[PDB]
């Protein structure tokens, strides 16, 4: 019954969850760029 009311009201039940997993791989990209700095330069220089 929950899916057919969300179908009626045009409510996406996973719009928050699809945007959650799409920013979680987007913040994994900048993390993959951020540790390229610390692997290259080191922890004392970065601090």
């Amino acid at each position: 019954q929950l899916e057919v009311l969300a179908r009626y009201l045009q409510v996406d039940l996973n719009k928050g969850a699809k945007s959650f997993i799409k920013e979680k791989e987007a913040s994994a990209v900048l993390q993959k760029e951020l540790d390229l700095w610390e692997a290259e330069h080191g922890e004392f220089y970065a601090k």
């Binding site: 057919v4 009311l5 179908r7 009626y8």
Partner: peptide
């Protein structure tokens, strides 16, 4: 004179349903 004769005798010469179908679409589901 025909007019009088004819007279004498009396023989003269939207979306509401689009809203409705989506209501039955809910109840059919």
């Amino acid at each position: 004179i025909a007019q009088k004769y004819a007279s004498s005798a009396g023989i003269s010469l939207a979306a509401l349903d689009a809203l409705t179908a989506e209501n039955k679409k809910l109840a059919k589901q």
